[PDB]
C-alpha cells in the first residue's frame, strides 16, 4: 500500500538498535516468554544429549515503535526484519554443541501499541543427564534452562505466558511420549557477580514405549 | 525527539571522531594494559579418550581499563553501568591454542559491561573442544591431567600484561558430571625468561 510505505519510512529514520526500549531508565522491560515444541528429534542415551525443535515466542513492549492507525490508512500491523529492531538475548545455559545465538532472519510483528512479537525457530542440543537403572521401563527427566545472559533482574524481568509448554502443534514421535512439561521462574544469585539474574526452567517428564 | 539517558550517553561515548575500536588504550608509547582474568567452570560434559578431546563450557571473566569510556554519572540522570555490543569496542583477542578444531576465532558476540570509571568487563560463553593427552597406563584407575592454554594471537607481552587473579578456578556453579571427578584446578601464569 501507499500509507504503509510512508509509515515504514517514518518509523526507522533514527533508531538506535542497541539501546533498551524504556521511556524512563530505571524501569525494566517485561518480556513475556513462551516456548512451543514441534517435534522431539532424538534423545541420545549414549552421548547424553537431547535434540529438540522449538519456537521461542518473545513478547515485549517498545515505547518508540508506536503509531496512530487513523493517520496511516487504518494500518495496524507491520512486518519488520529482526536485524533492525532491538531484541533480547535469550540464551539457554545448559547447551552442549555449537553456538548459543538464536538465528535472526525471521520477521517480527508490530502492533500499533508497541507490542513486538518475535518467533524464531531453533534446533537446541540440551545436555540433560539420564538414568538407565530401569530398562526399558524407565521415566526420564530433562530440563532446559532459558534465561537472559547480560541483563539484571532490574533491567529484564521474564514472565511466563502459560504455566506449561505449548504441545499444541506437536508432531508425534512414536518412541517417546511426553507426559507433562511444566515451567517455573527463579531468581538466583551467582558467585561471580553481585547482582540478581532471572531465568525460566522447563522440565520434561517422558516415558519410553517399551 | 524523545530519547533516553542511555541513548544520549551512547551517542556521546562511541563517537566516530573520538572512539576507534582498532587502536588500544595506551596513553603514551610502550604502556602495558594490565588485564586480569579468572575462569569459572560449569560442566564436564564429555571427555572423548579415543580422539583425545575434552569438552567443557567455561566462563572466563576478564576485565581491564579503558580511559575513553568514562562519563560523569550525575550528568546523565544517573547510570552506573552500561551495556554495549562486543563488536563496537576494543577487546584483546584471548583464545585457546590447544583446541581440536581450527576455530581460533572468538566466541559468540554477546554484549559486555562497562562501568562508570571505564572498567570494561567481558564474559562470553563458550564450549571448547580442548586437546589434551591421555595418560592411559593405568586403566580404568587413572588420573588425567588435561590443560587449557589461553593466549592472545594479536598482541603480546610487550603490549599487554596478563595477570592471574585467583590461583584456583572457582567451582561454585559446578554441576556434577557423574562420570569424572575433579580433585583440584590449579592455574599458573607462565612467562619465559630470555624471551620477551
Amino acid at each position: 500500500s501507499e500509507a504503509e510505505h510512508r509509515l515504514f519510512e517514518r518509523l526507522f529514520e533514527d533508531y538506535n538498535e542497541i539501546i533498551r526500549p524504556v521511556a524512563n531508565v530505571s524501569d525494566p522491560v517485561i518480556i513475556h516468554f513462551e516456548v512451543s515444541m514441534s517435534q522431539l528429534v532424538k534423545v541420545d542415551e549414549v552421548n547424553q544429549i537431547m535434540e529438540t525443535n522449538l519456537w521461542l515466542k518473545q513478547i515485549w513492549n517498545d515505547y518508540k515503535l508506536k503509531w496512530n492507525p487513523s493517520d496511516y490508512g487504518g494500518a495496524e500491523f507491520m512486518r519488520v526484519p529482526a536485524q533492525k529492531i532491538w531484541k533480547p538475548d535469550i540464551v539457554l545455559y545448559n547447551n552442549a554443541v555449537g553456538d548459543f545465538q538464536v538465528d535472526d532472519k525471521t520477521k517480527a510483528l508490530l502492533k500499533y501499541t508497541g507490542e513486538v512479537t518475535w518467533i524464531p525457530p531453533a534446533i537446541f542440543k540440551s545436555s540433560c543427564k539420564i538414568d538407565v537403572t530401569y530398562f526399558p521401563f524407565d521415566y526420564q527427566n530433562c530440563t532446559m534452562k532459558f534465561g537472559s545472559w547480560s541483563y539484571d533482574k532490574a533491567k529484564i524481568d521474564l514472565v511466563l505466558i502459560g504455566s506449561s509448554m505449548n504441545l499444541k502443534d506437536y508432531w508425534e514421535s512414536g518412541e517417546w511420549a511426553i507426559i507433562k512439561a511444566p515451567g517455573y521462574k527463579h531468581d538466583i544469585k551467582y558467585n561471580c557477580c553481585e547482582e540478581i539474574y532471572p531465568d525460566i526452567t522447563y522440565s520434561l517428564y517422558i516415558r519410553r514405549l517399551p | 525527539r524523545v530519547a533516553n539517558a542511555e541513548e544520549k550517553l551512547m551517542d556521546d561515548l562511541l563517537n566516530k571522531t573520538r572512539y576507534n575500536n582498532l587502536i588500544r588504550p595506551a596513553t603514551s608509547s610502550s604502556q602495558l594494559i594490565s588485564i586480569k582474568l579468572q575462569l569459572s567452570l560449569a560442566q564436564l560434559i564429555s571427555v572423548n579418550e579415543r580422539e583425545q578431546i575434552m569438552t567443557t563450557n567455561v566462563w572466563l571473566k576478564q576485565e581491564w581499563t579503558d580511559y575513553r569510556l568514562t562519563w560523569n554519572s550525575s550528568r546523565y540522570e544517573g547510570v552506573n553501568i552500561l551495556r554495549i555490543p562486543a563488536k563496537r569496542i576494543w577487546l584483546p583477542d584471548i583464545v585457546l591454542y590447544n583446541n581440536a578444531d581450527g576455530t581460533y576465532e572468538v566466541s559468540v558476540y554477546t554484549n559486555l559491561i562497562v562501568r562508570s570509571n571505564g572498567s570494561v568487563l567481558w564474559l562470553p560463553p563458550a564450549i571448547y573442544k580442548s586437546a589434551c593427552k591421555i595418560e592411559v597406563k593405568y586403566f580404568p584407575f587413572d588420573q588425567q591431567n588435561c590443560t587449557l592454554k589461553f593466549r592472545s594471537w594479536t598482541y603480546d607481552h610487550t603490549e599487554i600484561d596478563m595477570v592471574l587473579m585467583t590461583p584456583t578456578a572457582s567451582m561454585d556453579d559446578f554441576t556434577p558430571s557423574g562420570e569424572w571427578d575433579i580433585v583440584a584446578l590449579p592455574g599458573r601464569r607462565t612467562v619465559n625468561p630470555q624471551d620477551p
Epitope: 510512508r6 517514518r10 521511556a23 508506536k66 503509531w67 496512530n68 493517520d71 | 525527539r1
Partner: antibody
Framework: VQLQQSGPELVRPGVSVKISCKGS????????LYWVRQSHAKSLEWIGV????????NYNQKFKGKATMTVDKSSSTAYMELARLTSDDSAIYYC?????????????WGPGASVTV | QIVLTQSPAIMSASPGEKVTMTCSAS?????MHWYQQKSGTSPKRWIY???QLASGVPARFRGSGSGTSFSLTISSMEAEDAATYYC?????????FGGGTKLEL
C-alpha cells in the same frame, strides 16, 4: 472532545503560579500533554511534555530550572507550576493533547489561560 | 539546534489567486507539520507529514518540500481563509515553532 483550563490570573513578579488542564470526552491515558506558551507578538514556543500514564517528563532547556509538571490519576488532571516569574513571561499558556505516535502533533487544543505579570 | 524562519512575514491575496508560503530551516530534515490559528480562537492541526491533510480540511491545499526548504501552496483562495500559519519540526531536540505568516485578503 474538550479541554478545560483556569481563568486569567494577576500575579506579582517573584511568586510562583499554578495553572491546570483537565480533559474529558476521551480516554485520558495513552495520549500525551504538550505545554506551549505564546507571547503578545504571536511567536509561540514550547515548554514541556508529560506522559499522564507514567509521569515521565521532558523539559525544554530554556525552562529546566523553572517549570514543574505533575499529573493526578484520580481526577485525570495535569498541573503546571512556574517559578521565577519576570516581566518577560506575560503570555498565553496552552495545554495540548496529542497521540504519542509518529504524527507527534497537537491533535487538540485548550482555550488558553492568560498570565499577566 | 534547528531554528525555523518563515518567508514572507506579512502577505495578502485576492479571492482566486495562487498563494505560496515558505518555511526554511538551518539544517536538513524530512518531515514537518503545519498549524492554522484564526483570530481569537485556538489553533488546529492542519497538515502533517509535509504533504497530508487533516480531517476537516478542504482538498485545495498542497504541501511539498524536501531537504532544507518546504512550502505550502493554496490554489483557490477562500473567503474565510484569513488566519495565521505556523510551521514546526520535532526531528531535532527541542521543539521549535515558526515565526508565523499572516494571510489576509
Amino acid at each position: 472532545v474538550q479541554l478545560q483550563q483556569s481563568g486569567p490570573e494577576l500575579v506579582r513578579p517573584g511568586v510562583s503560579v499554578k495553572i491546570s488542564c483537565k480533559g474529558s470526552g476521551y480516554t485520558f491515558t495513552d495520549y500525551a500533554l504538550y505545554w506551549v506558551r505564546q507571547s503578545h507578538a504571536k511567536s509561540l514556543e514550547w515548554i514541556g511534555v508529560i506522559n499522564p500514564y507514567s509521569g515521565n517528563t521532558n523539559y525544554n532547556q530554556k525552562f529546566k530550572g523553572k517549570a514543574t509538571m505533575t499529573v493526578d490519576k484520580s481526577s485525570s488532571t495535569a498541573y503546571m507550576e512556574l517559578a521565577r516569574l519576570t516581566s518577560d513571561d506575560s503570555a498565553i499558556y496552552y495545554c495540548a493533547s496529542g497521540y504519542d505516535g509518529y504524527p507527534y502533533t497537537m491533535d487538540y487544543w485548550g482555550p488558553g489561560a492568560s498570565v499577566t505579570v | 539546534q534547528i531554528v525555523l524562519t518563515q518567508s514572507p512575514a506579512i502577505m495578502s491575496a485576492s479571492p482566486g489567486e495562487k498563494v505560496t508560503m515558505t518555511c526554511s530551516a538551518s539544517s536538513s530534515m524530512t518531515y514537518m507539520h503545519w498549524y492554522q490559528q484564526k483570530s481569537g480562537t485556538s489553533p488546529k492541526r492542519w497538515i502533517y507529514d509535509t504533504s497530508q491533510l487533516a480531517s476537516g480540511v478542504p482538498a485545495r491545499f498542497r504541501g511539498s518540500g524536501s531537504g532544507t526548504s518546504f512550502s505550502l501552496t493554496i490554489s483557490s483562495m477562500e473567503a474565510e481563509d484569513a488566519a495565521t500559519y505556523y510551521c514546526q519540526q520535532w526531528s531535532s531536540n527541542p521543539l521549535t515553532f515558526g515565526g508565523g505568516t499572516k494571510l489576509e485578503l
